[PDB]
Design a protein around this nucleic acid. Structure first.
Length: 48
DNA sequence: GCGATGCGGAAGAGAGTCCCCCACCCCCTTTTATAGCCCCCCTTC
């Protein structure tokens, strides 16, 4: 359960349903370098 | 009467898995020697 509970917590820790796509994982306030390694490498870095 | 605006729906992006003018050079022409090559007309039968 702890593995399942951890995934659900990360998807709801910010008070809204956060998808595990780029639209939810890159929107969270992480560093641009982490975001660029996931998806949208240049668009993420251009915005930063 | 006289304007002014937010939301749903549709659309659309965006990401993942040629013709002319201006130098410069060559050939036009003439002379001559050389000789193989080849076109053209003539001649043969």
């Amino acid at each position: 359960y702890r593995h399942l509970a951890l995934l659900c917590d990360t998807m709801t820790c910010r008070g809204h349903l956060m998808a595990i796509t780029r639209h939810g994982v890159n929107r969270q306030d992480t560093g641009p370098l982490m975001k660029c390694s996931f998806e949208e490498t240049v668009d993420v870095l251009m915005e930063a």
